[PDB]
């Protein structure tokens, strides 16, 4: 429920409570709200929301042609 993550889409922060990612992103995930919002770290005192759908594991990010 709390894995470190790979973002694979930019997401652009729309709330004071989001993150900005983009593409290679590393995200320490926190929580996982439900199956569309997890809540995480991108550095120390970096933490928001971010949807689900933009990331990926390590495993699969490593494996991208």
Do not use: C, M
Request: glycine share 8%.
């Amino acid at each position: 429920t709390a894995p470190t993550v790979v973002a694979l889409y930019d997401y652009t922060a729309n709330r004071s409570d989001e993150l900005t990612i983009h593409r290679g992103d590393i995200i320490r995930v926190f929580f996982k709200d439900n199956e569309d919002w997890w809540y995480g770290s991108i550095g120390k005192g970096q933490e928001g929301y971010f949807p689900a759908n933009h990331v990926a594991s390590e495993t699969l990010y490593q494996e991208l042609p």
